């Protein structure tokens, strides 16, 4: 993807992270586990939801075909009528397919971007207090117990303290 995170430097997703789109996994002497980042998840939910409603709504006004009948010596206007009705169907079919293709691409990239930005958010806190492993993970120089881990997810990671 455009932002390099999803199926990029972060090789694959987590079947084990069940309660959000993006989050953290920690490993220390007390154990390990997954925690969803609520803020970035909810941001994603609001965006995609607005997108779908925007898409549905924009297609609200759109051509409706009406039955019109013509006799045997009104073939020209009958044919005009047919070409007209068909032409608008083709225009709106095209609009709908193209919009879905384009926005689907944008939706996948939006997620990629949200992941890259959460990764950077964490990177910019930890600075030189952790090794950047290259795979989504940071390996700490100090021990980082659950309270420590929580401060990274907080936004509160006290860099001078370590």
């Amino acid at each position: 993807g455009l932002f390099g995170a999803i199926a990029g430097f972060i090789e694959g997703g987590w079947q084990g992270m069940v309660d959000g789109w993006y989050g953290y996994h920690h490993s220390n002497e007390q154990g390990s586990g997954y925690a969803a980042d609520k803020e970035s998840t909810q941001k994603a939910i609001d965006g995609v939801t607005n997108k779908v409603n925007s898409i549905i709504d924009k297609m609200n006004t759109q051509f409706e075909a009406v039955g019109r009948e013509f006799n045997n010596l009104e073939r020209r206007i009958e044919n005009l009528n047919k070409k007209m009705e068909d032409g608008f169907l083709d225009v709106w079919t095209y609009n709908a397919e193209l919009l879905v293709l384009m926005e689907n691409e944008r939706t996948l990239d939006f997620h990629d971007s949200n992941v890259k930005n959460l990764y950077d958010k964490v990177r910019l806190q930890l600075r030189d207090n952790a090794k950047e492993l290259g795979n989504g993970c940071f390996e700490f120089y100090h021990k980082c117990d659950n309270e420590c881990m929580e401060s990274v997810r907080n936004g509160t990671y006290d860099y001078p303290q370590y």
Partner: protein, 321 residues
């Protein structure tokens, strides 16, 4: 000790297309195209359609005697007509400005039939021998029930001068006709007078029809023709007839009580015993999808029609293998 940033995966096999890549598996998706219908013709919001069955709009309105089912139809939601109804003009001919009338019906939900010129009231003419083998009823020769085919009485077709004043409130659809006979001998045989006419006038109408002799192929056993005409008589307006012969006089005309959204839908299907908010010629639709691909000609509260086989939006993200 470490902390990792990552993303959701799941057991989903839903796929979406993008410009650069097709069939991308995603964790979540949302179909927006309705592909199914119930295959039936149904009531639209509880209000039944007029299913003309084997009759046409002409058969119905002129009162083709095989279309007695529709002799007094209640309010309808839409109308259903087959592609080639068998019970059309039983006596062959034409229906003038037929399509323009059908278009008028698309804005009508209810007709109320009323008698404007009683059959009994034709005392100077024969009004009960206006029948043919082309329009049979229960084994016997009959005719379009709404118009009266008048013929000579005691070898005399005196001039007709009739007038009807639209004193009711609702626009009135008046139908009448002319008979085109085979030869000079048939003309005098039915109407006596050799050169005849029908003159019709209203506030706006200024018509004068003359019968037209020609040798014609037989159609339903007849080489003679009927040509039917109509108008909409406004309220307080009067229609005026004058004829010499060949006149198919109105008996019944239709009162236009309810104007509104309607449609003539072309379909072979019968009634489904059924209710819907959105109807198509192939079946009814019940969904919240913003789109469908069933048929372009719908009536009711419907999704928008597109020619797609598939419309699915990504909501979630690229799912891992």
């Amino acid at each position: 000790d470490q902390i990792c940033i990552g993303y959701h995966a799941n057991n989903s096999t839903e796929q979406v297309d993008t410009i650069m890549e097709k069939n991308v598996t995603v964790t979540h998706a949302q179909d927006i195209l309705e592909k199914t219908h119930n295959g039936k013709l149904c009531d639209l919001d509880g209000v039944k359609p007029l299913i003309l069955r084997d009759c046409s709009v002409a058969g119905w309105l002129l009162g083709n005697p095989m279309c007695d089912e529709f002799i007094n139809v209640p309010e309808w939601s839409y109308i259903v007509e087959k592609a080639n109804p068998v019970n059309d003009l039983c006596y062959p001919g034409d229906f003038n400005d037929y399509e323009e009338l059908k278009h008028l019906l698309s804005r009508i939900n209810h007709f109320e039939k009323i008698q404007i010129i009683p059959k009994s009231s034709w005392s100077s003419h024969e009004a009960s021998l206006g029948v043919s083998s082309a329009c049979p009823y229960q084994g016997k020769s009959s005719f379009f029930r709404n118009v009266v085919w008048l013929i000579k009485k005691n070898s005399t077709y005196p001039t007709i001068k009739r007038s009807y004043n639209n004193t009711n409130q609702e626009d009135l659809l008046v139908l009448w006709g002319i008979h085109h006979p085979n030869d000079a001998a048939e003309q005098t045989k039915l109407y006596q007078n050799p050169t005849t006419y029908i003159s019709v006038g209203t506030s706006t109408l200024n018509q004068r029809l003359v019968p037209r002799i020609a040798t014609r192929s037989k159609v339903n056993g007849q080489s003679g023709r009927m040509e039917f005409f109509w108008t909409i008589l406004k309220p307080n307006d009067a229609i005026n007839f004058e004829s010499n012969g060949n006149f198919i006089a109105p008996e019944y005309a239709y009162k236009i009580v309810k104007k509104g959204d309607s449609t003539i839908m072309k379909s072979e299907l019968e009634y489904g015993n059924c209710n819907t908010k959105c109807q198509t010629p192939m079946g009814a639709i019940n969904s919240s999808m913003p789109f469908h691909n069933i048929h372009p000609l719908t009536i009711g509260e419907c999704p928008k029609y597109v020619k797609s086989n598939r419309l699915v939006l990504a909501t979630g993200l690229r799912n891992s293998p």
